Amino acid sequence: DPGDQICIGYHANNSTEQVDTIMEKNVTVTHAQDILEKKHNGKLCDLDGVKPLILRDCSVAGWLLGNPMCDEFINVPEWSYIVEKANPVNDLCYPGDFNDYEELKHLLSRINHFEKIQIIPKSSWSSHEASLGVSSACPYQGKSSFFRNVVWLIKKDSTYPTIKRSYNNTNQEDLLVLWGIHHPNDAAEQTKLYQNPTTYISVGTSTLNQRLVPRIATRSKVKGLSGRMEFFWTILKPNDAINFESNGNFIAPEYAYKIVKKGDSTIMKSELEYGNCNTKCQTPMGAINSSMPFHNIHPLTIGECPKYVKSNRLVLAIGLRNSP
Amino acid sequence: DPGDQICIGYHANNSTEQVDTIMEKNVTVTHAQDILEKKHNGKLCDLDGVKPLILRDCSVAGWLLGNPMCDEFINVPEWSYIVEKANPVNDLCYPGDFNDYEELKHLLSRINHFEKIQIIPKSSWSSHEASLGVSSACPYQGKSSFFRNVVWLIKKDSTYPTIKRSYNNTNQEDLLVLWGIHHPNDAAEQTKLYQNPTTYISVGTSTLNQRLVPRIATRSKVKGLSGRMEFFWTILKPNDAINFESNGNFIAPEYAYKIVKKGDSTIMKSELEYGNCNTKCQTPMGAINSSMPFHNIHPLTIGECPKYVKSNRLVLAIGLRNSP
Amino acid sequence: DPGDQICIGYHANNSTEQVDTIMEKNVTVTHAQDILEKKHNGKLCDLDGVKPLILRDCSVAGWLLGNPMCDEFINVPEWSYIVEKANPVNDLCYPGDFNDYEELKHLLSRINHFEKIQIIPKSSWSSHEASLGVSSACPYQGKSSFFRNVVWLIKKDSTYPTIKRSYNNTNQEDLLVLWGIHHPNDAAEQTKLYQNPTTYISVGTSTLNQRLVPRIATRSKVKGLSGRMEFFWTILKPNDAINFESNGNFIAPEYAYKIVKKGDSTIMKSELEYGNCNTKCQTPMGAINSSMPFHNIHPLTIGECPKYVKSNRLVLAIGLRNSP
Amino acid sequence: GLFGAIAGFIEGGWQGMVDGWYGYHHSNEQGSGYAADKESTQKAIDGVTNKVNSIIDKMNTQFEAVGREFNNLERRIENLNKKMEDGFLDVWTYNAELLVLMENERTLDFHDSNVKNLYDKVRLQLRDNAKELGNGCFEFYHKCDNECMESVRNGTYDYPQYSEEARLKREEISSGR
Amino acid sequence: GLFGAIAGFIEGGWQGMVDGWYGYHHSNEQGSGYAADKESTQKAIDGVTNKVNSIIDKMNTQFEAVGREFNNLERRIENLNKKMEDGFLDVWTYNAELLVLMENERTLDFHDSNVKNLYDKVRLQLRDNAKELGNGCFEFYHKCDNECMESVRNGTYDYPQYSEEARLKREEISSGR
Amino acid sequence: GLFGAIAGFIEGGWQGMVDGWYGYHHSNEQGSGYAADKESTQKAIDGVTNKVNSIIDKMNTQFEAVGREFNNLERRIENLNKKMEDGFLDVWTYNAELLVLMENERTLDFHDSNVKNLYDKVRLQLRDNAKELGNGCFEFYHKCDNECMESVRNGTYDYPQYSEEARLKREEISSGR
Ligand SMILES: *[C@@H]1O[C@H](CO)[C@@H](O[C@@H]2O[C@H](CO)[C@@H](O[C@@H]3O[C@H](CO)[C@@H](O)[C@H](O)[C@@H]3O)[C@H](O)[C@H]2NC(C)=O)[C@H](O)[C@H]1NC(C)=O
Ligand SMILES: *[C@@H]1O[C@H](CO)[C@@H](O[C@@H]2O[C@H](CO)[C@@H](O[C@@H]3O[C@H](CO)[C@@H](O)[C@H](O)[C@@H]3O)[C@H](O)[C@H]2NC(C)=O)[C@H](O)[C@H]1NC(C)=O
Ligand SMILES: *[C@@H]1O[C@H](CO)[C@@H](O[C@@H]2O[C@H](CO)[C@@H](O[C@@H]3O[C@H](CO)[C@@H](O)[C@H](O)[C@@H]3O)[C@H](O)[C@H]2NC(C)=O)[C@H](O)[C@H]1NC(C)=O
Ligand SMILES: *[C@@H]1O[C@H](CO)[C@@H](O[C@@H]2O[C@H](CO)[C@@H](O)[C@H](O)[C@H]2NC(C)=O)[C@H](O)[C@H]1NC(C)=O
Ligand SMILES: *[C@@H]1O[C@H](CO)[C@@H](O[C@@H]2O[C@H](CO)[C@@H](O)[C@H](O)[C@H]2NC(C)=O)[C@H](O)[C@H]1NC(C)=O
Ligand SMILES: *[C@@H]1O[C@H](CO)[C@@H](O[C@@H]2O[C@H](CO)[C@@H](O)[C@H](O)[C@H]2NC(C)=O)[C@H](O)[C@H]1NC(C)=O
């Protein structure tokens, strides 16, 4: 005969979730909680509302200078973030250098919209030749061409009279202005294009005080050319003025960019393309839609995102140890 | 019948100190210990014995070159740390540039005292005009004037004969030397001020090898002026000599600075003024007087200070859990 | 009368190992484990198979340019890591400068072997004097001399005809190439050495476009000399060509270096010399031979090594507490 | 575990207790059944939810990597840049992995301590009115119906009330009959 | 807590024990009173003061910010510079706060462990010479004066000495009159 | 320690048990001796070995300092470079030193928890067939040979089997003789 009884015990079930501990691995428990997000959609999406500027085979340089092969991006709408490939094919179509180029790429990460404006009209070049500035290194479509936002001026008749051109920024927003100098291959070519043998480019701002001088040298062929192009940039503050003076080898501006909207942004390196989707967290490898507090997709994300970690596994133990 | 008794119990009291724990927040305990100092006195004080260099409305640049409006700091006494406002008003009174300026400010964070010494007498300029180098951009008090430590040389009669001057650092300490060049607006002004149209400033050391050339350009007006001044600096090692040769556009030194005591220091950004107090821990927001191991005032401290963290609260549990 | 008994107890022994814990220091226990390695062998060793490059008193500059006193390293074998003293004695024997020198040192950390090649034969300078390029600041052994991998050309008879020289890299690996320019003391000396008073050095690559000009200045004597030499470098890509042109003041190449093997490497700063030993872990203080997971020798180690920490003691507790 | 209850003197957990982590299994004359302890179950849930939230919250702000680009003769700072972003990514992975690991242990020994502290809240209510069997169950020396079991569950159990019947049942088993 | 002593089987602490953290409350023929256990109180003080010092001492050196200035075309390294100084300050804040939370718990379960260990040192001295009430108090089966209570406190308590008087009082209660 | 066994009710350890950490000391008619518990000793070894590997292994990746050189006008970033590499070494040193200190404590209270849990496995096998001495030893109320001690060690011990002999020996001490 059994006298009345009472027992104390604990929960168990059919759960085979496993957790880990400093002293013990793979311990099976009642309840667990995963905190690591591991899945993405392999696609580039809009961020909340907004579509990213996806340069395809274009570089930041190609777009802003206006490489002919970059005509897709002649007047871009506002972006959330820029996507650029690792080695864009259409950079500086005519071989050369973009000065302080990285620092320019930096300003772009807090810029969300530009507005292209003409500050020296191509029609205005009455005593020089605006339309002979064309290269085989810069092909539009078989027709050989040039960068669109800038102008490769050349001598008229036999002469190249001194240029004095100026633009006063009467806008309220900052202006990104681009220009350049051309470095010929020998004195013979120099005097053929520009007449005058000893030349310069001076550029005046309330802050700039520049005088560039073309630099003759014998060089290896790049894309069939030995000459080179070297580009330069500035920010023109509101109510300030930029003043050009030159005498040869001047690659003059036509269009500049007004900085119209600033904000969170980034230049994202990725080979992917537009995914026609939308998320609140984007990664160079795909977008994330998740409640997890942690992910291990890629450290460079933009938007309302989980915190990045490198783990393969992060699971918390919540319930109690489940029966052997 | 009460049999004899013995009981085991624990302390309790009238303390309402609350701590937090991983599983429970605001747990009331017997004894607690705050380790975070949160109070400062909002003043800029001496640091132990020594009074800080407080530039009121001057910058490091305005002080060192001797902006006429900065006469307060003409002969500063030894200091403990420098304090500079975020956007000082009296900087380079004549518009232009201070070369490698940050890297110079970097050195100041370990300099505690200078001694201004005259290395090229203003009176010595016998065949040039020392006393005409004066600008309306550089006002003393309505009298238009100029930087005090450098001299703006000008042609005398009609000519500007080639300058050759040199100073041999016969001190046992390092010399901070300053000088500069002027960029006029046109060919006209160049020949008006200096006669000679094609000019240079050469500067020589055991390590320096510089040849500056004035850079004519059309620029926006700054303070009513279109000209520019561009200043340079070097550390002249003991028993070394520096050599100047120039020919126009030379803004020559009179005084330089011997680095006389080095040590810990910093340049602190702050809007404050002198506080007429004294401490052993100073912060751009005010001084700290505390025994606590932690504070949350400001990350940039100089002196014997608690370690900074970003918390609002850090309290350790000492006693035991206090009665419900 | 004692009834039968059973007791439960624990291990103890003759151990005086002490560990620490958060609440208690120096707690003596049964078994402990040290995990901190504290010993090294005070010598610089081979790293697995390979001998380190030990410059004795040379700097990296001295080696590559070919300082006469640096003849030990005229054709060094493949290395595992380079060791350099804190302030090498045999640097640039002729006073001057090595441009972007640190950026070059950085490249060295991924290079294990060069192969010196002749790209412009000292014999070919048919209309200039290759053999007068010699200085008292550059002594061999009393015989004054010059850097060996480059050649200081001087005017022949009374003239200095314009140089045009070039090399096309037909090798399959990259080429480190060096050259330099000479800064005279005055106009008088300029024409004595080179005849032409106004001179230049141009260098062209698929990516370079340089035009250097000598910089006359009155300067302090260094090693009894007032003039200066300034040296430059570039990497010449396979199938690319370099073209020199000058007119005076040119310090022309003879030899350049082909990068033949890349891999892990470092430039280790140390005063030590060759240890005639061998490791799997090397340190600027001595080699480490250990199973320990941690060491506290020096943070800069190369090879299969323990992780560095600054601690003086790291011991884990393994057994249980040893009797009071 | 540290406290010797779970997977201890209580071999096995009860598949049948489906409304709590910890509980009771009574067995008197009227029959048997399962009943979960509400206060200790609730005491642990609040403890675990505060733990989960303390962990997610501590990693709220944590280093966030940013894209920076450097050219070809900026190799030095480029490398400084990389080791930095890598460095912090390494720190914060270690902080995360280790925190889960350490607090995973402390979570399991909490459930253990909770069961054993529940076992002893019962042990010190009954005392000599019942016999501790050693498997985590108690055998009464008196009769205890359903309203008495309830007094045990919620802590109402009256000792002087049953101590008389118990001390007489003890006498009955000491003698032998 | 974890050990079921503080706010456990000992519900409530004694407002009247003003000379220690842990202690006793005796009650015999002569009267009653409080007596704090001085060495266990002293042994916990030594542990907690070492804990406070361990925490302050591990933060000996920790990142110290330095002021650095940059120009308009040095934006890249300027940005690099902020993320790092920010980076480390976030690490040391995370570490400070996290160590305080963790060792706060281990402190409270330390005091808990100290009570439950004090209750059982007395319990295994007395054994069956006193009856466990379960409320953290003991009821003796023999007479114990002030020189006898003191023998329990400092650990002097003699079991065979009182075992005769006690085993006869156990039997008087077996009979129950 | 935390659980009151080591340096608790078991004052002192047995110099004589050279084949394990925790164990038994039998004492019957045939004589006495030391015998180590095979199962509990192994349970701690696996735990300590996994901790030792867990600690080394988490320091898998950690900041590795690298050489960088800077010129005379790169003074600022020279300083940035230095405070960074320094910074990370301070972090990883602190992360390491602190982890051992913390896992040193938990290690000692693991062994403590293990002894006290072996004592209770036996106490809850025997119950009233033996008398609890309080020094960690049990005195049987019955006769127990070497195959009986073994039944206790490996957990085979039969309670109803000896319960009659023990309950008669309990009554003899009730009478006085
Ligand atoms: C670019 O064009 C802008 C167009 O607005 C010009 O800015 C204007 O300049 C005039 C003087 O030429 C300023 O007028 C002055 O106002 C001040 C008080 O603020 C007074 O002291 C003067 O007597 C004068 O009346 C006017 O402020 C300014 N406009 C704005 C919107 O600020 C400017 O001339 C051109 N910029 C350059 C660099 O050439
Ligand atoms: C600038 O002034 C310093 C200090 O007055 C001068 O340096 C001194 O120069 C003389 C030569 O005119 C040195 O004398 C020499 O001593 C060496 C041994 O050190 C000896 O071998 C020579 O035969 C010669 O007589 C003197 O030592 C030196 N003093 C110091 C302290 O260095 C010099 O006039 C100027 N220095 C420069 C770099 O222009
Ligand atoms: C440096 O020397 C290299 C090594 O010979 C030269 O590279 C070669 O350049 C020639 C042109 O002179 C290339 O010939 C071409 O062949 C391709 C087919 O392979 C064809 O597309 C063209 O119609 C042309 O005939 C040759 O491919 C190329 N070799 C390699 C391996 O790429 C080069 O000329 C020299 N560089 C300079 C700047 O002079
Ligand atoms: C932990 O459990 C897992 C699950 O079986 C094991 O980890 C590995 O899991 C993969 C599948 O993802 C299987 O190939 C093996 O089961 C495991 N691989 C290896 C290489 O071991 C593992 O067995 C358990 N870990 C430990 C330490 O016991
Ligand atoms: C911690 O205790 C305080 C006691 O008031 C609480 O802290 C917060 O502060 C405001 C005003 O000081 C209180 O009215 C609120 O209760 C708290 N604010 C918020 C936004 O929660 C708080 O109640 C306690 N903490 C927790 C987690 O309950
Ligand atoms: C830890 O034990 C050692 C035992 O020597 C002590 O640490 C130091 O070492 C010297 C001998 O080398 C001792 O005499 C000193 O006590 C210590 N030196 C210094 C400079 O303090 C120490 O006694 C113990 N540590 C603590 C905190 O008690």
PDB file of N, CA, C and O and ligand atoms in Angstrom, chain C residues 18 20 25-26, chain E residues 50, ligand 6:
ATOM      1  N   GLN C  18      50.325  28.607  -7.927  1.00  0.00           N
ATOM      2  CA  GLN C  18      49.332  29.571  -7.494  1.00  0.00           C
ATOM      3  C   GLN C  18      48.646  30.226  -8.678  1.00  0.00           C
ATOM      4  O   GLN C  18      49.301  30.645  -9.626  1.00  0.00           O
ATOM      5  N   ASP C  20      45.254  33.079  -9.729  1.00  0.00           N
ATOM      6  CA  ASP C  20      44.564  34.239  -9.217  1.00  0.00           C
ATOM      7  C   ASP C  20      43.148  34.062  -9.647  1.00  0.00           C
ATOM      8  O   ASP C  20      42.861  33.214 -10.483  1.00  0.00           O
ATOM      9  N   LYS C  25      43.773  36.638  -4.783  1.00  0.00           N
ATOM     10  CA  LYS C  25      45.043  36.506  -5.509  1.00  0.00           C
ATOM     11  C   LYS C  25      45.843  35.353  -4.912  1.00  0.00           C
ATOM     12  O   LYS C  25      45.603  34.962  -3.766  1.00  0.00           O
ATOM     13  N   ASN C  26      46.728  34.753  -5.703  1.00  0.00           N
ATOM     14  CA  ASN C  26      47.699  33.781  -5.180  1.00  0.00           C
ATOM     15  C   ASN C  26      47.062  32.554  -4.445  1.00  0.00           C
ATOM     16  O   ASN C  26      47.541  32.145  -3.383  1.00  0.00           O
TER      17      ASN C  26
ATOM     18  N   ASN E  50      38.456  43.044  -2.972  1.00  0.00           N
ATOM     19  CA  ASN E  50      39.357  42.583  -4.025  1.00  0.00           C
ATOM     20  C   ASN E  50      38.682  42.640  -5.409  1.00  0.00           C
ATOM     21  O   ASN E  50      39.356  42.833  -6.413  1.00  0.00           O
TER      22      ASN E  50
HETATM   23  C1  LIG G   6      51.545  37.080  -4.856  1.00  0.00           C
HETATM   24  O1  LIG G   6      52.588  36.252  -4.453  1.00  0.00           O
HETATM   25  C2  LIG G   6      53.884  36.826  -4.672  1.00  0.00           C
HETATM   26  C3  LIG G   6      54.869  36.020  -3.853  1.00  0.00           C
HETATM   27  O2  LIG G   6      56.193  36.503  -4.025  1.00  0.00           O
HETATM   28  C4  LIG G   6      53.922  38.331  -4.357  1.00  0.00           C
HETATM   29  O3  LIG G   6      54.169  39.091  -5.535  1.00  0.00           O
HETATM   30  C5  LIG G   6      55.350  39.953  -5.500  1.00  0.00           C
HETATM   31  O4  LIG G   6      56.696  39.276  -5.535  1.00  0.00           O
HETATM   32  C6  LIG G   6      57.611  39.616  -4.485  1.00  0.00           C
HETATM   33  C7  LIG G   6      58.735  38.611  -4.538  1.00  0.00           C
HETATM   34  O5  LIG G   6      59.252  38.506  -5.857  1.00  0.00           O
HETATM   35  C8  LIG G   6      56.870  39.624  -3.156  1.00  0.00           C
HETATM   36  O6  LIG G   6      57.806  39.686  -2.086  1.00  0.00           O
HETATM   37  C9  LIG G   6      55.915  40.814  -3.117  1.00  0.00           C
HETATM   38  O7  LIG G   6      54.836  40.587  -2.215  1.00  0.00           O
HETATM   39  C10 LIG G   6      55.390  41.185  -4.524  1.00  0.00           C
HETATM   40  N1  LIG G   6      56.149  42.289  -5.094  1.00  0.00           N
HETATM   41  C11 LIG G   6      55.658  43.526  -5.211  1.00  0.00           C
HETATM   42  C12 LIG G   6      56.569  44.544  -5.831  1.00  0.00           C
HETATM   43  O8  LIG G   6      54.528  43.813  -4.828  1.00  0.00           O
HETATM   44  C13 LIG G   6      52.734  38.895  -3.568  1.00  0.00           C
HETATM   45  O9  LIG G   6      53.015  38.879  -2.172  1.00  0.00           O
HETATM   46  C14 LIG G   6      51.389  38.205  -3.861  1.00  0.00           C
HETATM   47  N2  LIG G   6      50.406  39.171  -4.322  1.00  0.00           N
HETATM   48  C15 LIG G   6      49.433  39.636  -3.537  1.00  0.00           C
HETATM   49  C16 LIG G   6      48.496  40.622  -4.170  1.00  0.00           C
HETATM   50  O10 LIG G   6      49.309  39.273  -2.367  1.00  0.00           O
END
